[PDB]
Amino acid sequence: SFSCPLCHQPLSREKNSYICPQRHQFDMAKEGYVNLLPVQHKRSRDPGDSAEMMQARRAFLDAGHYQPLRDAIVAQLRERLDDKATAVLDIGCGEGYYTHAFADALPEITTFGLDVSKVAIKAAAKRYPQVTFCVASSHRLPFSDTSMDAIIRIYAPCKAEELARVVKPGGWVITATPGPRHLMELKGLIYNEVHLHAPHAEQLEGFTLQQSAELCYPMRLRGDEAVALLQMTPFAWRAKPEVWQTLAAKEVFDCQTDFNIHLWQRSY
């Protein structure tokens, strides 16, 4: 039920191509995703998130350190969605560590994983068949209005209007971002005085906060795992050698995680 990245009209499908009323065709890569981006802009980049690191976030998550969060969302959905659900969408579905679990937990429905990392989507789509992965910029969702029963937003940004447009009325939106104390001990190894900042409750014109939770728990990280984790965080470069030397030789590093989950309904 995609929309045309270009004319924004329903994408009708023929075998393995998507075509819109005005003859815009998008083919499916051999793996199964649907590229939906332009032809040659900014694709050329300044990564940070290229194959190397994707394999990291991935390899890190495959240790399930974050599974609690997935479990939380999965159950969250297993509950709100009724038996009249057709499909859910996962904005920012990276290589789909989280999404494939949602799908495996919602068989009767179609699971979509949108992300903007071609390299990521490729990896996802190849590993997880139970998900229809599409590759595009979510500044304007690649879906027809009122087409989704729920949308999962795990730390990936999005506009309110698009939420209102794509989500059926009575539908859901589930968002999860880091909480104040998320990964303190780590930030504790590199900052002058660690400033945790108290997040203001946000709002989605069009929805209703039906539940707000917090999920905090401690992780016993091994040397590598820690460094690995430090490696994929905004501050990584403030870590002076000493930090990495110790953090890496550390038998067990202790770090707590604090995620902030939300759950709104698309008003009827």
Ligand X SMILES: C[S@+](CC[C@H](N)C(=O)[O-])C[C@H]1O[C@@H](n2cnc3c(N)ncnc32)[C@H](O)[C@@H]1O
The bridge status of strand 207-222 relative to strand 252-266 is: antiparallel
**Minimum CB distance to ligand X smaller for 79 or for 155:** 155
In the complex with ligand X, the residue whose CB is nearer, 32 or 94, is: 94
Q: Which residues bind a copy of itself (CB under 8 A)?
A: 45-50, 52-53, 55-56, 59, 222-224, 227-228, 231, 234-241, 244-245, 248-251
Residue 268, class by beta-carbon neighbours within 10 Å (0-12 exposed, 13-18 middle, 19+ buried)?
A: exposed
Q: Return d(Cα 148, Cα 166) in angstroms, integer.
A: 6
Residue bearing tokens 């946000």: 202
* Contact with ligand X (CB under 6 A) among 139, 232, 238, 252: 232
In a 3-state reduction of DSSP, which class is residue 99?
A: helix
Which of 4, 36, 57, 89 forms a contact with ligand X (CB under 6 A)?
Answer: 57
Ordered strands of the 25-27 beta sheet: 12-14, 17-19, 25-27
Residues listed for the chain: 268
Check binding of 6 to Zn ion (CB under 5 A).
yes
Which residues make up each annotated binding site for Zn(2+)?
4, 7, 20, 24
By C-beta, is 7 or 59 nearer to Zn ion?
A: 7
**Helix (H) and strand (E) counts for the chain?**
8, 11
Q: Which of residues 178-207 bind Zn ion (CB under 5 A)?
A: none
Burial class of residue 267 (count of CB atoms within 10 Å of its CB; 0-12, 13-18, 19+): middle
Q: How far is the CB of 174 from ligand X (least distance, A)?
A: 12
Residues 110-169 that bind ligand X (CB under 6 A): 120, 154-156
Q: Which residues 11-40 are close enough to bind Zn ion by CB under 5 A?
A: 20, 22, 24
In this complex, which beta carbon is closest to ligand X, that of residue 69 or of residue 106?
A: 69
Residue 259 contact, options ligand X, Zn ion, a copy of itself, none, Cβ 5-8 Å cut-off depending on partner type: ligand X
How far apart are the C-alpha atoms of 47 and 246, rounded to whole Å?
28
Query: Quick one: DSSP state of residue 170?
Result: E
Binding-site ranges for ligand X (CB under 6 A)? 57, 61, 66, 69, 92-99, 120, 154-156, 176-178, 182-183, 232-233, 259
